[PDB]
Amino acid sequence: QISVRGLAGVENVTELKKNFNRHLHFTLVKDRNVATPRDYYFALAHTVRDHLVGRWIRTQQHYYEKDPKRIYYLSLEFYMGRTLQNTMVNLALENACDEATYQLGLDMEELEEIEEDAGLGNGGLGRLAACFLDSMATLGLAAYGYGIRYEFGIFNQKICGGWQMEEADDWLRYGNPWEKARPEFTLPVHFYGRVEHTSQGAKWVDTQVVLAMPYDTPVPGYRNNVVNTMRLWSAKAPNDFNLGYIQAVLDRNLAENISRVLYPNDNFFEGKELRLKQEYFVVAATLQDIIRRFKSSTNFDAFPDKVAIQLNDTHPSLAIPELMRVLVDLERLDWDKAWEVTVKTCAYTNHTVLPEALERWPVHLLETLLPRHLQIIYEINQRFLNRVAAAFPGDVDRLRRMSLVEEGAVKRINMAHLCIAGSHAVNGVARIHSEILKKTIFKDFYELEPHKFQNKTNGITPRRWLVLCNPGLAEIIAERIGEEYISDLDQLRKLLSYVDDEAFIRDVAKVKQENKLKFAAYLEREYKVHINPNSLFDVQVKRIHEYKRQLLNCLHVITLYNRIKKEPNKFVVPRTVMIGGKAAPGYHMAKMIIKLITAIGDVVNHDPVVGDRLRVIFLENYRVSLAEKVIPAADLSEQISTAGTEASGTGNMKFMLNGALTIGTMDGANVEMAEEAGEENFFIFGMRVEDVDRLDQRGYNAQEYYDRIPELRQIIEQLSSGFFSPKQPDLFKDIVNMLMHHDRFKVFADYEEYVKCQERVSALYKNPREWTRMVIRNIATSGKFSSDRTIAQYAREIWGVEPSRQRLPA
Amino acid sequence: QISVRGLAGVENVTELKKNFNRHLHFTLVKDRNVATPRDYYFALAHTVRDHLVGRWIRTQQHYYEKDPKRIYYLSLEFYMGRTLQNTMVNLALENACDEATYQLGLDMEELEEIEEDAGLGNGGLGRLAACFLDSMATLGLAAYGYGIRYEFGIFNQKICGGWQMEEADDWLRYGNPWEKARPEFTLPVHFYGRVEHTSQGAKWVDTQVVLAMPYDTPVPGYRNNVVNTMRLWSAKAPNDFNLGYIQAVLDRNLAENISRVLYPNDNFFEGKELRLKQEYFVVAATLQDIIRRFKSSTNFDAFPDKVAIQLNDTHPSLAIPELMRVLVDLERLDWDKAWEVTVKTCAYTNHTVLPEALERWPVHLLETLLPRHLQIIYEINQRFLNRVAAAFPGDVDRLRRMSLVEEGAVKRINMAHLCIAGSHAVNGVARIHSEILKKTIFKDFYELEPHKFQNKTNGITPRRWLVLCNPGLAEIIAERIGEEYISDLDQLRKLLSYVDDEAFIRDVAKVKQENKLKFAAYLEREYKVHINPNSLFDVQVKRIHEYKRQLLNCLHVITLYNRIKKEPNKFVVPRTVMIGGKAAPGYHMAKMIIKLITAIGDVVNHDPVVGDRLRVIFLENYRVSLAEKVIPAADLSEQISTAGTEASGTGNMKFMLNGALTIGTMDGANVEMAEEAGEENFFIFGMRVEDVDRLDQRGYNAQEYYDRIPELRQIIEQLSSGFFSPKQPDLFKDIVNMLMHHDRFKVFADYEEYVKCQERVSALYKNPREWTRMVIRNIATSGKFSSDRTIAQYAREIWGVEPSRQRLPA
Numbered sequence A, B: 001q002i003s004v005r006g007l008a009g010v011e012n013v014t015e016l017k018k019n020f021n022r023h024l025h026f027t028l029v030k031d032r033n034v035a036t037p038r039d040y041y042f043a044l045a046h047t048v049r050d051h052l053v054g055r056w057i058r059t060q061q062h063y064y065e066k067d068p069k070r071i072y073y074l075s076l077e078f079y080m081g082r083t084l085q086n087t088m089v090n091l092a093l094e095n096a097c098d099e100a101t102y103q104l105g106l107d108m109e110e111l112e113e114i115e116e117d118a119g120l121g122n123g124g125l126g127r128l129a130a131c132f133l134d135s136m137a138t139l140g141l142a143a144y145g146y147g148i149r150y151e152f153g154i155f156n157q158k159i160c161g162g163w164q165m166e167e168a169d170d171w172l173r174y175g176n177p178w179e180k181a182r183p184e185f186t187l188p189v190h191f192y193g194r195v196e197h198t199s200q201g202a203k204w205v206d207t208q209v210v211l212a213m214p215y216d217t218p219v220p221g222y223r224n225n226v227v228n229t230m231r232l233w234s235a236k237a238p239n240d241f242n243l244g245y246i247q248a249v250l251d252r253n254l255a256e257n258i259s260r261v262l263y264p265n266d267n268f269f270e271g272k273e274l275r276l277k278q279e280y281f282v283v284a285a286t287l288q289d290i291i292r293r294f295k296s297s298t299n300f301d302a303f304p305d306k307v308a309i310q311l312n313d314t315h316p317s318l319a320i321p322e323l324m325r326v327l328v329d330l331e332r333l334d335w336d337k338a339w340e341v342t343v344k345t346c347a348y349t350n351h352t353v354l355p356e357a358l359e360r361w362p363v364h365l366l367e368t369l370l371p372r373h374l375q376i377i378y379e380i381n382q383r384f385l386n387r388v389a390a391a392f393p394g395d396v397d398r399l400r401r402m403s404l405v406e407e408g409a410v411k412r413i414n415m416a417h418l419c420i421a422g423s424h425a426v427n428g429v430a431r432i433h434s435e436i437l438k439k440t441i442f443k444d445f446y447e448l449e450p451h452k453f454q455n456k457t458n459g460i461t462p463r464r465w466l467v468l469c470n471p472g473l474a475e476i477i478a479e480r481i482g483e484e485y486i487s488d489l490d491q492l493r494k495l496l497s498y499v500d501d502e503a504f505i506r507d508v509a510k511v512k513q514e515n516k517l518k519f520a521a522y523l524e525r526e527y528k529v530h531i532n533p534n535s536l537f538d539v540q541v542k543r544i545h546e547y548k549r550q551l552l553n554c555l556h557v558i559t560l561y562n563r564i565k566k567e568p569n570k571f572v573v574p575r576t577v578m579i580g581g582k583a584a585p586g587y588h589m590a591k592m593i594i595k596l597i598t599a600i601g602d603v604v605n606h607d608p609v610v611g612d613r614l615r616v617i618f619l620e621n622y623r624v625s626l627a628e629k630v631i632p633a634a635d636l637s638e639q640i641s642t643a644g645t646e647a648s649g650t651g652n653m654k655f656m657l658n659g660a661l662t663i664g665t666m667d668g669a670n671v672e673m674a675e676e677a678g679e680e681n682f683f684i685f686g687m688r689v690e691d692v693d694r695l696d697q698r699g700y701n702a703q704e705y706y707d708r709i710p711e712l713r714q715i716i717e718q719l720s721s722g723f724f725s726p727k728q729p730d731l732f733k734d735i736v737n738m739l740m741h742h743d744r745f746k747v748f749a750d751y752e753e754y755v756k757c758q759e760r761v762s763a764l765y766k767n768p769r770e771w772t773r774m775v776i777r778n779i780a781t782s783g784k785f786s787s788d789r790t791i792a793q794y795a796r797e798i799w800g801v802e803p804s805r806q807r808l809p810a
């Protein structure tokens, strides 16, 4: 149908059809008489995956032959989503498969909905890893993603009586066609035990052993015939484990629990032993794999020339002492040489400045679980602090501030300090975030080693986040400027010369309308909820956190409702306000926020005076597959975190690429987005980081705002009195109390400017032509936020490798 | 190479080769450069399994169209062994695959050794189910095997310091190419809860739900294009199970533990809750499947016309009250009609008379786990006992003897009594066993309902147990009488006319010699143990039990050793005595017996005076795959259970078919074997059942034998004094004490006759021509012991269906 989806040749369509029938028969053991839609999906998945194998084998053979420097991206999260469409897009098979299935009497889009998301992540950090893998393959880098194959990913969110309920994400139930188990590359991982000191160095003994079994998943580059590997480890008990008899076999579950479930607590670091085990498990297994591949090329001087390890946050920080352990204890290198190798090999990416999210592991945990690693960490600390003492003589408080060991009630290890000490590069994920790192939380480290600190502004892959999810927009762009922009997003700048083009303006607006209609239909079919597709689609989708200020959005919604109720016969621009996202199961306040949103909806959506002028919908089970649907349908992107709290954001970039305007604070990547598009083409409001700091010095008093803003007072009165919860009058007392007395994120302080700015949004939306022209200016300047740019910067500035857009032979 | 292994056509060999390469590439994601022998096995397995799919789909479609009476064989055990060679044999693909792999530069026999046994059984009962499935497919019956997919089968046995060690049989580690998961046919199974009585009958409520997910495995008939299904259930937690958050997900293991491991305790009934859960799980899931298939044909009068359920022992006895529950509570049939249907549907096979093996479930267990079933069982009992009271008025002790409920310290349900009451047919597994059932343990039931009691003498499949494991013997037989005997084993009688044939005598003896050399080589390669291939191969392989009297064999071995030591320069027929088998992990005495055997070996095998005249080897990890190796190599089969204790035996039949002579008691099927071959061609010894009974009435005094047999006294003195355990003098005190004071199985009573009979064996072996002639007479009369005969008898006499040797179209 559309050009960017590839050719549907006679030979290819015929071959796809026969291989589809072959798989249905030989692979699924079905015939068309009893086959379900799910059987058809799997037949298609097997048909498509066949096209990956040759490229996958020869890419990996190519790396073995050419022996380039290898990039190892270590993460506890890879938020991949669905794989079928992405594979088709990257192999130019989409139209061919669409045709082939059509001729078989099947709707491919229907088959695509059957695939489970690989939800092996929580939000931004996990999704970033996924975009990064796509870009590394597209840029021809010898890159490997290493993580854990969780049996259960991020929970499925159900909403019951307005409350979030969690259920297990049993994503492997029907089997995963995109993985290949590699039980032959199974590796032992050690836990517990004790350290023996001998004549010939330290020895870690009496350990318990858990096996790490790898599963390989392909990562196809965009039409370059490159297929990289994401290798995920699964925990397996050894066969003599616990070996009355029956119990010993049943107890195998204990060892295998390591890879059972993804921790969903993105709000609050929990020092849970199982989480620590997960972190070491991925690190220990991965490093053996790295070293094996390096030896299959004695001399570890060349190790940093052939290996880069990127630590995605501090979660895999144990790579640093583990590498030291292997180099010193097993390979018998001297400390100083091992340390030089380690530092040159490792680099660390920070993803937050919120103190409660920082990993600070109790010493007693590390003492029991990883006794040798604790000793190594102590030695790292001593030698590091001796360097600090020499650079800043007599500065005793600096020494305690910079220590990897935190003294207190329980002694803790600061994993962020460990990462900085043992990495040659430390980066933040947006310019303002990287600056905040140097100025505040890691200031001491920056002063000691300024050369270590870099910025790498986040990006998103334009394959998933434009071509895949918004083919209509991709096509109207390709009609004017060609297809090259898909792997060179800066080319979107050429669209600036079409800002006055009447045909293009009409097409951009039409694509959005089509997307909105498609999404309005989805909501009715799958959730039986009805919306007005002519209203402004006002969306805030992201994990529920106080810092992200879904509550500020709630306050605006209630403001609009109250203004309508006051002047019912006055015209207002119709809005559909959509808020979605999961709360960490133990995050009470975030769970209360979800309940608030639904409670507002219950009042607003059933008020006859309101009509279809205002609708508030909670988007259930927000996940990658839902993002791919809602983002193309959005008109307004809510990016309203308190300045200095959102390290980057990536959702923001997805909305910008897909033709929504942004209302946001000058926080994270919003700053750079406004800079690229021009501040005139952005709806900026609220305190800057400097204003937040000023307010903190003075002391934040929420009562002041309550006293001076009558509309805000009304809302707080309504919440308190039980207007939004008639049968449980005091339901939202926790929310009110927090807002009034202990709001870390200054919701009230940005309220007036927010509401004012929202009025300017409604004003522009009344003028469809000018709304769309500003949209074109956003899309046209979204190029910088391609993860291809981000990865090219990591490659050149951190990893010391050059990207390549060159095809491998097919 | 050999004719019975099929044609190796040019077209087939070429096609097998290309499909092998296709699977290696697309399925295994490897190329020849990095492929391991295991990769090659899997490529071959996938290549062969492709040939099953068409036949499998059309067999099952055929049953749906023709709607024959369906046979459901319910067992907690299916001891399948390896599947690759069996599939090739039944599809006539063996020579073609041999050629195809040869041309690829691979040894197929080497690839075959890589396959794990499906060890989903303990011994005879489990293996019988497997032979039965093969015969039902070969005889064209619409048959389904239903059981549990254990994650861990029978433990792998390691011998360490002479002691049995158990390790987990992780048979699914590399994946199972012979199964197809069917998550679409997943069914709920209920546990716990309580019974509510309403106006409209009883209701079972507040249950916990465990999901049953089926996995289908093909059962190919012998060259008839029939492929039946063995459906095995796996336990899955529902997604809202236990749904702080992390624990709830981890607790899913509790529900899924149901299908985790096979109970190995074949010696002693353990009333463990997990085992009860397993038994109900298979029954509940299976019956829903049966009823679904029956409805997809309101009127349950026709149920017994379209359904037969065979209960393999009492393990699935809960099928009786479960069927009643469904018919009465869910379908709303009256009790009397439901009961008529149930009785006509169910049949029960008994496999033992040993009281400690009989399932007697504590009422308190059933009360908690299955409250509705207990109520149904009580009602069954009341109505049954009313029938007994009417037939035998005033006989009050009969009433308590026949009750399904046993009174005592803890009230128990006798599952065997439940099975007899609710089945239209009850059978033993050999003529003497079935007679013992009518005369002793079920005498009361026989008097009430004599028509219910039948015999179905056990059999073995001549496909696995001749063609597959002994191709050399199969071929020399086919050379004279054709190939028809393979599915009509009675044709082996034609070999009687070759008993004086000099060419045939020479060939039979040559095949045995070749088998012995092959096995002597296997022992050196895989276990580094050396044997004399010219010695008599004296083998006893079977689970270790006191009733099977491995101890009596031990006494003979020591007798031979002592006789050699007394007269060293006297000629004795050389023997390699091989004993193998697993002991249930909690069976102390059986574990002591294994240690005794190894301890004897340690003394005998290192005595220079003995030389190579006597060797004692413990065969480690006896299992189906090992049986296939050792049985063709055997000269003498030890079948020496105390008369009246071995219900049938099937190992005995395997040895008879493969050219070994039998030394045995008149127990189980040995009686019928001797009857078929002629007592002159069998080495029969020891007490008959009647002699055992006489001895019991008098009182068994082992001291009498010790006092009157000097050679026996010497052995007991040696055991006591520490001759076989120099550093632990009292090691075997338990064994001696048992033999002397509490031997239920009268080892001493058969000692003299046993030793005497063994002398006659050695005498015959000195005359190779006469040894072989007697062998021919055994093989020639082994026809009755084909499971084809057994299954045809079940079909006609119990199930009411006619077998068919007719091909389905290819």
Ligand SMILES: OC[C@H]1O[C@@H](NC(=S)N/N=C/c2ccc(Cl)cc2)[C@H](O)[C@@H](O)[C@@H]1O
Pocket (backbone or CB within 6 Å): A049, A050, A052, A053, A174, A175, A176, A177, A178, A179, A180, A181, A182, A218, B026, B027, B028, B029
């Ligand atoms: O889904 C059922 C099972 O499939 C298996 N896959 C096998 S046998 N081949 N895959 C080949 C392959 C080819 C191409 C690609 Cl792009 C990925 C895998 C998986 O190893 C196993 O984990 C899974 O449960």
Ligand SMILES: OC[C@H]1O[C@@H](NC(=S)N/N=C/c2ccc(Cl)cc2)[C@H](O)[C@@H](O)[C@@H]1O
Pocket (backbone or CB within 6 Å): A122, A123, A124, A125, A126, A128, A263, A264, A265, A266, A267, A269, A351, A352, A357, A429, A458, A646, A647, A648, A649, A650, A668
């Ligand atoms: O850089 C990518 C994105 O990273 C995010 N960080 C996230 S998702 N941390 N999760 C941490 C976490 C901690 C513990 C657990 Cl158990 C789970 C998740 C930033 O908030 C966002 O601004 C940025 O764009």
Ligand SMILES: OC[C@H]1O[C@@H](NC(=S)N/N=C/c2ccc(Cl)cc2)[C@H](O)[C@@H](O)[C@@H]1O
Pocket (backbone or CB within 6 Å): A026, A027, A028, A029, B049, B050, B052, B053, B174, B175, B176, B177, B178, B179, B180, B181, B182, B218
């Ligand atoms: O081995 C990896 C996985 O394979 C899967 N098999 C699939 S996708 N097709 N099988 C088709 C098939 C065809 C013929 C026959 Cl005779 C048996 C199965 C199994 O369902 C799964 O349990 C297992 O782990």
Ligand SMILES: OC[C@H]1O[C@@H](NC(=S)N/N=C/c2ccc(Cl)cc2)[C@H](O)[C@@H](O)[C@@H]1O
Pocket (backbone or CB within 6 Å): B122, B123, B124, B125, B126, B128, B263, B264, B265, B266, B267, B269, B351, B352, B357, B429, B458, B646, B647, B648, B649, B650, B668
């Ligand atoms: O008829 C086939 C064979 O059946 C055998 N019975 C067996 S293996 N019972 N296992 C029982 C059992 C009980 C509990 C558990 Cl957890 C495991 C096994 C007979 O002993 C044998 O004579 C006969 O030939």
